[PDB]
Amino acid sequence: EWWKEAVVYQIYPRSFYDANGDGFGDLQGVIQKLDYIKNLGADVIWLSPVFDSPQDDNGYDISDYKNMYEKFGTNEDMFQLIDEVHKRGMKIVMDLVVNHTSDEHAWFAESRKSKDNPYRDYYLWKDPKPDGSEPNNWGSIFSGSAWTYDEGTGQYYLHYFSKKQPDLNWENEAVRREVYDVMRFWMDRGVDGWRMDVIPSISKYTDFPDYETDHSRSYIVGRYHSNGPRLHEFIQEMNREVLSHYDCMTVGEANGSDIEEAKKYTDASRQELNMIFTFEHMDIDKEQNSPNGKWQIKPFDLIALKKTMTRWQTGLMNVGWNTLYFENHDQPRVISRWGNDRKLRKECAKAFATVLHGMKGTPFIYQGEEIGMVNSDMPLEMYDDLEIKNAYRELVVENKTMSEKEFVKAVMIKGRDHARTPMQWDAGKHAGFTAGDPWIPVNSRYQDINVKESLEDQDSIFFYYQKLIQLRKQYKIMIYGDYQLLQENDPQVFSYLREYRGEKLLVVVNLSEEKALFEAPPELIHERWKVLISNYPQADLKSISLKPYEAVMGISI
Ligand SMILES: [Ca+2]
């Protein structure tokens, strides 16, 4: 299946390329950079959402599923992009955002008018408690309550995300039909698949029970916010009504998912989705459940990474399918977060890439990951994301569960905007992103980190990624082989083995700044190896003295 063998490149289009000079990346800009992506070697593009939206959550608050936001272009520009993707032998996946819409979507503008409106039951409306307060103690992921009051009609509406992202009512069959008609509209025009935004949230517990009260916080995000009673029923209905009618790929964004849930979504026999993004490996550097959420930082712990990635590799080894990612539009640059982004930036970027691309699953490359883009030193006032604005207000100003200094430090490590500063094309003004003024500043280190310098340097992170993708297309063991963690207890080295039809692939990566040692276990000592890739210049893999961030992948001969 082409989706098993794919390498996906995720574009965050407002930050990719600005062809028309307004500072906002656009769909013709994407078209003009497709040759670059094909030369890297990715065969599938996932576009973050370009549908009409007032941009409260930068496109994830959609106000029209059948038209583009004007700064991206028009549907004609989108149809051309689909065509240009296909002319290059590639595929395009769009972002399906159907847990919620914008409050400016015509559906919601109508819903909120009156209880008798035909759109009233497209959304989730509930009476206040007798004292006027919210139906329950559920929280929003972007801080505060999940409920907002509408004075006109005397009810609250639910939003798991912002107050400008009212949640759709999937109990109403008319809403399910509306979603399936959106999907067919785009698929009939050549969209090859969907990345499904917060897909585990679409089914609600319609009794809306309170969470057990904590004492540490007023609003709670927990187990009712996902995996509702009708979740898999709905995904199975979407497959029958839509996905089964096209040659397509689907990936669900699945924050909160564990390995058994992943098998419910991804086991082919269940006729749901092809794969999902879990957050469990993204969650290793926060406390389990602080009121400060992901902003309650912990240092990188390689043993925690090895345990989580291994549970996923073994859990979906012979049923379902994994996604493989360290970066996306919601995550910091991994080398800044967990590694060295200075003197060992190249070695480190290549080392995290080798850990990831040596595994079973579909790899995702976030725009700029392939040139080693890094987190930004911009001051807090320059950040754009509503998530930061809302968390500063709740955690620092109001509840005082984080100090100013601690919050600033956490945002410098994990703010989503580190992913969103423009793609770095060359060393000229605004890194070649725009001839105008970019919507957020370009990262201050762009003169040293960009596509131009990368293509001029044979030792670039770019060529290393290009090689990993080539290897994947040449060596079927990388796609189909099983997985075994080796040297499990080593606190510096992530090593593992893939096996397929009597061939072995050995991946050994020192995720640390200091020297380390890998010794092959006893069963492998009489293997002969050929080195397929390494991030140091100078094949006896039974014993490897590893330099800082040294990575090597060998195949048995
Ligand atoms: Ca533009």
From Swiss-Prot:
Matches recorded under Gene3D superfamilies: Glycosidases (3.20.20.80), Golgi alpha-mannosidase II (2.60.40.1180), Oligo-1,6-glucosidase, Domain 2 (3.90.400.10)
Please, which domain of life does this record's source organism belong to?
Bacteria
What family is reported?
Answer: Belongs to the glycosyl hydrolase 13 family.
One annotated GO molecular function is: alpha-amylase activity
Binding site residues for Ca(2+): D18, N20, D22, F24, D26
Q: Active site at which residues?
A: D197 (nucleophile), E253 (proton donor)
Q: List the residue(s) that the UniProt entry marks as the site Transition state stabilizer.
A: D330
Effect of temperature on activity?
Optimum temperature is 42 degrees Celsius.
Its annotated function is as follows: Hydrolyzes various disaccharides such as sucrose, maltose, and isomaltose with different efficiencies. Also hydrolyzes longer maltodextrins from maltotriose up to maltohexaose, but not maltoheptaose, palatinose, isomaltotriose, or isomaltotetraose.
Instruction: Give GO terms for biological process.
Output: oligosaccharide catabolic process
The entry's protein name is: Oligo-1,6-glucosidase 1
Keywords assigned by UniProt, alphabetized: Calcium, Cytoplasm, Glycosidase, Hydrolase, Metal-binding
Can you say where in the cell this protein is located?
A: Cytoplasm
Q: What is its main location?
A: cytoplasm
Signal peptide position in this chain? none
Q: So what EC number does this one have?
A: 3.2.1.10
